[PDB]
Symmetry: C3
Subunit: 166 residues, 3 copies
């Protein structure tokens, strides 16, 4: 496999299992107890200032890609200023836009989550595109585009909550 | 504890925490970031060509067994050609039949899942027997036999989905 | 960071990632595959005879504390005789009282769970106080005090179930 590209200012804990073509930008913080393996789906991108918390798994399917902001194909693209919090599962093909909060134990698989979404705890997002700036309440199981199209806009209280966690 | 029995063609990543009387058959693939410990409930069986993905925990209660296909008692029996996908929890007593798909973050505990079931994501299966060839939609919490008895049959689209993941 | 205080009779598996001011009392059993890190929120307390099972993450927010039974501030306080079972997430600020059962894949975050509660599987408890002696059925997503105030009392069958798991 190709080697990870780790920006000089990124922090990757030695207990993180990081393998393959994972392109990690400035000031990223990857906790211990994380798995980020581009051994099937590849490449991955993790944007600047993004935090990947303990218990997270990031993996991808061999087949299936999203378009990154650079126009290249990725198995997993996670933008800048994203929080991928404890126990989240980000499974390619997946795009998570800048500034998203992905709350505890939530999954994004075969999906696009637009910039500035606040996804709460114990959520499943699969097989859909969520436009920018939407809020997903805890426990929701979003598997159809019709559900995704009903989601409310992020309100100030949702941003404040996400800020208080991160 | 007894030692694992690892078939010559099985792959067990060095980062897997594999302990005790775990009987692993041909062409099994056990990922890093897995825990498969027969230190309480024992023995375990993992059938041929089965894949155990990163984030999975397989454990068992000291008391409580299922009958394996060899007539012996097991804490956990996982059949041939099974996919135990990311973050699944298989907790003995548990039987998972040949060809099952157990989707991301799903739990099987004190239960029997018949051959050829397709269990989707974020599912709980506990204290029930699911007959062969049933589909469990994402997010379902199955804790009673009445619920298990309502499950739909696997359709071609469900098999195709499972095939596309695996 | 400060070092953990590990009682002479406590068992902490060498594969546990235990860091910081974590105060672990008599006969605690911490499994492999656990993460218990007081590197942000601190301190933590884990009371006597408590079991922390494989797959658990215990972490805390830098800001936000609960009052422990000693009157001191903690990010996470887990009492005596508690079972924190596989894949549970206990995230500070959090108080879990003596004798609680926290079932598989359940989360307690920014919450107080009174002594003697039985919390089942795939539960979210967030932003609430649960009084002592309540039962939380599997799959419940408790995010408001109104929901917490509706919970049933633990019945003998719930205690028996918890006993059969632990
Ligand atoms: Cl973390
Ligand atoms: Cl999980
Ligand atoms: Cl894997
Ligand atoms: Cl354990
Ligand atoms: Mg883990
Ligand atoms: Zn995968
Ligand atoms: Zn166990
Ligand atoms: Zn945290």
């Amino acid at each position: 496999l190709a080697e990870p590209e780790i920006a000089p200012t990124a922090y990757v804990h030695s207990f993180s299992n990081l393998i393959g073509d994972v392109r990690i930008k400035d000031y990223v913080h990857i906790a211990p107890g994380t798995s980020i393996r581009a051994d099937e789906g590849t490449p991955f991108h993790i944007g600047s200032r993004t935090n990947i918390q303990d218990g997270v798994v990031i993996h991808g399917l061999q087949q299936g890609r999203v378009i990154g902001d650079d126009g290249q194909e990725y198995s997993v693209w996670i933008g800048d200023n994203v929080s991928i919090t404890h126990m989240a599962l980000i499974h390619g093909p997946a795009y998570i836009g800048d500034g998203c909060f992905i709350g505890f134990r939530s999954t994004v698989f075969n999906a696009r989550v637009g910039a500035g979404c606040v996804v709460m705890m114990h959520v499943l997002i699969q097989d859909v595109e969520i436009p920018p700036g939407k809020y997903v309440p805890s426990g929701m199981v979003i598997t159809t585009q019709q559900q995704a199209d009903r989601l409310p806009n992020v309100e100030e209280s949702d941003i404040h909550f996400a800020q208080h966690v991160v």
